[PDB]
Structure formats: structure tokens, C-alpha cells
Amino acid sequence: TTGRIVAVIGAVVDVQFDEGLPPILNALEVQGRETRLVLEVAQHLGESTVRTIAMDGTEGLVRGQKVLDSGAPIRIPVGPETLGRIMNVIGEPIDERGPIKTKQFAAIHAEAPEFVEMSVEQEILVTGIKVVDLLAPYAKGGKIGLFGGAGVGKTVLIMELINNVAKAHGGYSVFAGVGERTREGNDLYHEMIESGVINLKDATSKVALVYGQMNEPPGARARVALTGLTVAEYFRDQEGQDVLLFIDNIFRFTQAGSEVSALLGRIPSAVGYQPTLATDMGTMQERITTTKKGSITSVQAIYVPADDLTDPAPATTFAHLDATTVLSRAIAELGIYPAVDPLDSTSRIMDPNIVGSEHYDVARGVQKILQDYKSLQDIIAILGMDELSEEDKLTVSRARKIQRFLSQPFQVAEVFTGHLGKLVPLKETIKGFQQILAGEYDHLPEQAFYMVGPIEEAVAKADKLAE
């Protein structure tokens, strides 16, 4: 029915209802705004009152203002006419192109794909990024996570991912920027119109955009990700299609949840996250999945607060992944972009009975030698290098080569690197390392592997640096 605001703090408005107490989750309508204001219901304090989160700023509201029970959960422009279009938290379009035109709408608060719908098929999605493919390949239609502290190359990676993986793809992609930089959305729109995965003219757009950046309220950010996945959940269940869902940054979801949690009546828990950080994540990751009906390759990027991979946010995220690429500040700081930690990155399909004994045996061999080099690391740098074995100056030599050959000039990073982009096919990666490992280049100097593509392009820099 109709309801009247009783109280308002920051982002949490309580409302009172004569008769029609809206069920939790039910989207409510603020009457009297120069721009639409929705209030996702959050609890029944009782006496016909309901506490709620605002999907925009409450600047202006007034005790008694008119609120209307929209009768059901936030609903969005799910459907095929979302491609090329920048949606938002509540459906409303914001590329300025007048209503998104569809007669199919779905609530963003769904249940989750039951046990029996689970698909157990996993096959290697090659990305052409050497480090990921060699040591921790992603899997077609699986949950992938990009771990990173601030500034280590999380976002750039996901670009070079949407560039590679999502271009040579004839299905549908849904990129949803939750809680990060507005500059970076505008930035992608135009790259994605230069490439024309978004085409303003025809209807050949292969990419739905949902957006709710670090400039919006906690209400928004807390739900922007619920929207962008409702969008990609359609393209899955219907088409049976191969939906690529990118998020950046799934962290801002729990942070956003944090900001209001206080004002919602929660004794805080460890590190001061919501007492619900756990399940909030669960009933929401458990939706970004692959059913028998369809498949969603998911590439989330997770902020690691202060790089502490144990911070209850990134920590709890790990359970929900099938392949995790973890980014290292110490690696980046050495100039080795993409700063992937070849010893904290993991895939479920790194099984010799899935990738073959050549692949596997070769990855693990690289992983090993890098680990061994890490071990000699505080002998040598404080107690004389040449005091090493013969065996060891050798496993150092090769290691540092291997370690650098693992870098890649990214195509979306030419602006930084200075070298033209690159991209290596899985089998030339396996081969490249297998060689270095085998002792076939112990003669070429270090820098020759730094930032080249296929292994030969290092033999190139091998003379270019020579004479």
C-alpha cells in the first residue's frame, strides 16, 4: 500500500505502513523525487515499520514523505535488448538512449541453482596469457577469480582478458563494474565501440553493461552485482548459450554491505565485517554458476584489503572459485607484469588426466624450480652468490629466465609497457618453458626473456641486445 518515512540516517531509511507491510527484499517507491529512489526492504522492526537500504542518496527526504509498496523485489530489463546498453542498479538506462525496450523482467533476488543442476564438465579455456595457461589454466564455463592488492594489475588483466577471450567469442558477454572507477567505465565503453563489441548503429552488440561505481551509495554498490548477474543469468538459462560474465570488483559488494551493516543493527565481527559476510557471499556466488541449462564463464576481480589475502573478504571468496589467479605486489614491483604469483595461483583442471602429462609435468617443473630459487634467496643475497653449488647457480640461472619469460607485453598495456601487445598459443608456451627448463638457453642472457611473446621472440631479443 502507501507508507510514510519515519526516520532517516545516511543510507538506511525506516518506513511505516498503515496496512501493507512489504516482505523483506520488496522494492519500495519514494514518492516525490526529481529522480527515482528505491528502497530495498531489509527487515521488520515491527509495529508496521520496515528498515531499508536506499539505491540512491537520501539527501532531501523528509519525515513523513510518501512511500509506495512496489509489491515485489527490484525488477530489471533482462533480455536481449540490453546489449550495447549501459544499465544500472535498478534498470534505468544511462548512456542516454531512452527506455530499454523489452517485455520480460526478472527480480534480481533469485534463489540458487540446486544440487542436481550442477554441471561437472570442465575443459581448458586457453587465454593466450602464458602464465595463466601454463600454470593455472581457466576452464570453459567456470568460476575464475582475479586476486589483487591495489595497483598490481588486477583491472588491466581483466581488460586484456575481455580483449582476448571475449572477442574471439561468438556468444554473449556481460561486464559489470561494481564499486570501482567511473573513469574506467567511460574508458571501456569507448574501447568497446572502437572494437565494436558494442555497435551504436546495427544490433550486433555482444555485451551488456551494468554499472554502479565508487561514487554511488552503499545501497547501490551492495546490489549492482545482484543486477549485472540477473542480466547474465537470463542469457544462460534461455539460450543455453556461452555467457561471459565479467565483474570488477566483486569486493565492493561485501564492502558496500559493510558500510550499512552498522546502521542495520549488527554487532560487528572479526576485522569488523558484517556478521554475515559469509552467507551474503554464498547466496550470491552460488548464483554465478553453470547449470545443465547453460554455461557462464565468470571472471571476477577481488580487491585484497591491504594485500592481506587473509582478510575475511578475499579469504572467503576463494572457496567459490575453480581457478584463481593471484597477483603479487612484490612481483609487479620487479616490473614483471602481469604480476601473477606462479606459486599462489591455482586451477582445478591442472590434472595430468585433463591437461596431459606433458603440460602438467612441465607446469609443476617450473613451479618447482621457482620455488627452489625462492629458497636460495636469503643465502645468496647476504652470504656471497658464488658460494652456491654448481647445481644451484644453474637452478638460479634458469629460474630467473623462466621467471621473466613469464611476463607478457599485454595488448591493453602498450600504453605502459612500450612493446607491441602479444599472445601465445598454449602449445608454444608449454614448449617454450619445457625448453628453458631443459637447459637449452643457458647461454642467452636474462633480459631476452623479459617481455617477449612466443619463445623464439626471445632468441630475437637475444641478438638485438647482443650486437
Binding site: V6, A7, D18, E19, S48
Partner: protein, 167 residues
């Protein structure tokens, strides 16, 4: 479950919560007025030199304080469906509170009737009308018949201002 007669005075939010009850408990049997006066009386059945040895006494408790309030109800001019707002405050340990619960009973009664705006210098305009500042003039006619930065701030300072004609 039951729906509630929230009369557009509302009042509280946390404590005089019993009050907000009986504008809805009363408005079924339209006995609003039967109590508007009933309470006025109990407000002093307790301010006696004979009722304060329990009024603020955690000594007797919810035993002989509720069934010794079957007296100051049944006996006197009460014993209706309002001998109970006591029998509640009796049990729910808030007899020490009723004065405030009656106070608000009023300020919610005289907003179905009167209006409360007040004059400047003396008593209540009780503008019991369908329109605010309509009868604000025609009822105060029975009242006759019974510039340099600083000087700026110092002129509004006497107009509608200060400690002067206030006394």
C-alpha cells in the same frame, strides 16, 4: 496482527508506547472521552500521602500491587476497559511511569479536537478549528478588547528580539 488506529499526533517512538495504544483501543467503542477524564483522576489517586509507599517501591512487587489495583479500579469511577492500562503498567513494572502515559494521552486527544499554537506573552489560543491561522486573528481581537555592519545585527536585535518585552 490487529490493525491500529494511529491518530495523526503519533507522539513518541520509544517509551510512552502504551499511550499510542489506547487511541486505538478506545477508538473501538468510541470511549475516547470516557477515559480522557478517567486518567485525569487516577493521576492523583497515586499522588496521595497513602499511595507513594508502592508508587516507587520495588518492595511489594507484582504481587500485592496488581490485586491491590483491583481496588483503585473496581471501586472508583472506573472499572471499564481502562482499568487495564493500569493492570498492564502493574505487571509490566511501569507504574512508576503512568503520569507520562496520561500526559501523552492528552496531547494526542487534543489534536483530534483543539490545536495547540500559543501566543507570545501568555496563554493558549486553543484554535479548535478545521483551519490553522484562520481563527488566529479573529480570536486575538478578544485581546485588544480584554546601515553600518553591526547596526545591521543590532536592529533585528530589538524588533522580534531578546530579553525586553519578553518578561
Amino acid at each position: 496482527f490487529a490493525k491500529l488506529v494511529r491518530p495523526p499526533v503519533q507522539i513518541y517512538g520509544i517509551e510512552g508506547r502504551y499511550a499510542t495504544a489506547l487511541y486505538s483501543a478506545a477508538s473501538k467503542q468510541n470511549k475516547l472521552e470516557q477515559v480522557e477524564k478517567e486518567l485525569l483522576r487516577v493521576g492523583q489517586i497515586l499522588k496521595e500521602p497513602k499511595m507513594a509507599a508502592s508508587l516507587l517501591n520495588p518492595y511489594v512487587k507484582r504481587s500485592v500491587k496488581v490485586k491491590s489495583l483491583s481496588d483503585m479500579t473496581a471501586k472508583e469511577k472506573f472499572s471499564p476497559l481502562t482499568s487495564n492500562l493500569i493492570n498492564l503498567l502493574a505487571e509490566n513494572g511501569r507504574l512508576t511511569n503512568t503520569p507520562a502515559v496520561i500526559s501523552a494521552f492528552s496531547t494526542m486527544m487534543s489534536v483530534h479536537r483543539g490545536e495547540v499554537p500559543c501566543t507570545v506573552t501568555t496563554a493558549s489560543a486553543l484554535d479548535e478549528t478545521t483551519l490553522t491561522e484562520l481563527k488566529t486573528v479573529l480570536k486575538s481581537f478578544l485581546s485588544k478588547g480584554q546601515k553600518y555592519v553591526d547596526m545591521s545585527a543590532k536592529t533585528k536585535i530589538q524588533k522580534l528580539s531578546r530579553a525586553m518585552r519578553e518578561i
